[PDB]
């Protein structure tokens, strides 16, 4: 889990927020792996990742990267989409397969939280006040 | 002080070259609206940033 980074366990105010120990992080351990490979290799593009064994202490993932400037990749349609600038650091905007699952996307009644395209997009729309011209 | 670095001596050189009156021929330009150097510094009253 995620220990809350507060000195000596003293969060301040309101005992619903007194939690330090049993707290959990919102993204998964696989998604934390894809971020750490993408921050180190900034010139590459994170494609996807998988699981190769745990431990009690550690957990190991192999992360598939793509160099977007090699001409075995820029000269291949159906993989040259990742050379577009809108796919830079796509593990940090949370949209590889591992980080996508923490966002609550999906179709149906189980996924009404993200029915604009994210949780913040839905929340923004149902909390603006539409003041038309002819109220 | 007498012991100073080079980039402080050059900082003090800029601040005493702009510590100067306005030229008298400036006042005769068309659309003047300026009459004295309003940002003139004195060593005894207003100290420098440095």
């Amino acid at each position: 889990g995620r220990k809350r980074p507060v000195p000596k366990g003293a969060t301040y105010g309101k005992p619903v927020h007194h939690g330090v120990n049993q707290l959990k992080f919102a993204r998964s351990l696989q998604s934390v792996a894809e971020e750490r490979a993408g921050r180190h290799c900034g010139a590459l593009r994170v494609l996807n990742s998988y699981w190769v064994g745990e431990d009690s202490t550690y957990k190991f993932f192999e992360v598939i990267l793509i160099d977007p400037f090699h001409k075995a990749i820029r000269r291949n349609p159906d993989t040259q989409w990742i050379t577009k600038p809108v796919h830079k650091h796509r593990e940090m905007r949370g949209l590889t397969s591992a980080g996508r699952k923490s966002r609550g996307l999906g179709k149906g009644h189980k996924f009404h939280h993200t029915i604009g395209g994210s949780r913040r997009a839905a929340w923004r729309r149902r909390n603006t006040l539409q003041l038309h011209r002819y109220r | 002080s007498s012991h100073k670095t080079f980039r402080i001596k050059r900082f003090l050189a800029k601040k005493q070259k702009q510590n100067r009156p306005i030229p008298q021929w400036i006042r005769m330009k068309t659309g003047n609206k300026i009459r004295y150097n309003s940002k003139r510094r004195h060593w005894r009253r207003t100290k420098l940033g440095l």
Partner: protein
């Protein structure tokens, strides 16, 4: 405080609302901007009918609305098979296939086959090379009636 008589109101304004207010003062601006993109698209597709493909007849899906009928997303593959036109030529003709729509009944199957055949007799198909008509249409048919259709097909 409640004063004497009236509703127990619960107004939803406890949540810093005036930071998020969508005014509508660009409303006549965007009715003009949308309308200038209808007029611009309709002259890009110059005899093609200004509104997109033909849409099927679709029965509305609940007990409140099943007496009325509307236009759907597209024609099912079973309607395309028995009207006898391929599912990959049909978008090039303006028919709009919908591949995930089932046909549970027969007379709603037949009403869209009848719609498809009546469309196919009605559209005018120009040849690829205008200097050499292969199978499309007669050149007299393409002259006095080659106008763009307005509104839905």
């Amino acid at each position: 405080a409640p004063s004497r008589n009236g509703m127990v109101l619960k107004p939803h304004f406890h949540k810093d609302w005036q930071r998020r207010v969508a005014t509508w003062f660009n409303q006549p601006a965007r009715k003009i901007r949308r309308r200038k993109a209808r007029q611009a698209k309709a002259r890009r597709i110059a005899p093609r009918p200004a509104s997109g493909p033909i849409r099927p007849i679709v029965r509305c899906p609940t007990v409140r609305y099943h007496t009325k009928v509307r236009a759907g997303r597209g024609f099912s593959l079973e309607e395309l098979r028995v009207a006898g036109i391929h599912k990959k030529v049909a978008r090039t003709i303006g028919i709009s296939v919908d591949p995930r729509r089932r046909n549970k009944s027969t007379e709603s199957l037949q009403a869209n086959v009848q719609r498809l055949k009546e469309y196919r007799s009605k559209l005018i198909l120009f040849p690829r090379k205008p200097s050499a008509p292969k199978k499309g249409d007669s050149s007299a048919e393409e002259l006095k009636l080659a106008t763009q259709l307005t509104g839905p097909v």
